[PDB]
Design a protein around this ligand. Sequence first.
Ligand SMILES: COC(=O)CNC(=O)[C@H](C)NC(=O)[C@@H](O)[C@H](N)c1ccc(C(F)(F)F)cc1
Ligand SMILES: [Co+2]
Ligand SMILES: [Co+2]
Ligand code: NA
Length: 262
Amino acid sequence: ISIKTPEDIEKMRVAGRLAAEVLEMIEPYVKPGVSTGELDRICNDYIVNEQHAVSACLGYHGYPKSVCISINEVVCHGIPDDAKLLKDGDIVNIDVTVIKDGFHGDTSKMFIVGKPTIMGERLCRITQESLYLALRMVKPGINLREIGAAIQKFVEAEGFSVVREYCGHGIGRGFHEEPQVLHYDSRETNVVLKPGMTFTIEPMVNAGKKEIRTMKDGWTVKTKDRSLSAQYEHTIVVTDNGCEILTLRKDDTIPAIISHDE
Ligand SMILES: COC(=O)CNC(=O)[C@H](C)NC(=O)[C@@H](O)[C@H](N)c1ccc(C(F)(F)F)cc1
Ligand SMILES: [Co+2]
Ligand SMILES: [Co+2]
Ligand code: NA
């Protein structure tokens, strides 16, 4: 597994901040009646013309848009569409990845449009809380297995399920690098964290059953039972005594630097 230098890590601070700032920028546009196609153009224009960066998703394995915008029962990889309008009660993930100065920053959050439904709000909250509990566990010497097991235990106790596919991932000069960061317990996982590892945690949580389905368009992933699904993602670096969140936003309610030292 690659170990980032202080120079590499500073570049990941910059890229992570940019990816966060896309999400802070787009918020006032996420309203009933807006199209997801429009949101994607606003994001790409900002990334290119203001941040002077590029979207990692655009063209990636042929993907036609710059961000992924996933609504309701869509689990991930929702394709921005000029005809797809947001409406009251929708839960919406926007997942951003930018490359700046050769390094990637990858982050997503949920937006609830108009008046929340109670179940949508709870699903989003439990999903963020599962990410936060995982972030609290990251420090050198901990095994990724312990973190995946903990996300799953927490989510399942709420009556929700964890998507097994699409895991978190190492990240740096490459969009996806070792390790795989599973959001569930597996005997295969034996990665003892070391300072300078950079990776994402990005749990997808379904209100219903865990199983998923890819649509005929070749991209869009939905819950098999058409239950709601939510995701949040941060890029982090492991430090000598904990971690540092590289994609933190003003609306996050966890500190950027988490220290396990007395
Ligand atoms: C088996 O299919 C896969 O795992 C393809 N990879 C992913 O979906 C990975 C896990 N997704 C991520 O890392 C996301 O956080 C990331 N922002 C992203 C989102 C979409 C894509 C896509 F490939 F669809 F363009 C690639 C990467
Ligand atoms: Co992402
Ligand atoms: Co990712
Ligand atoms: Na969803």
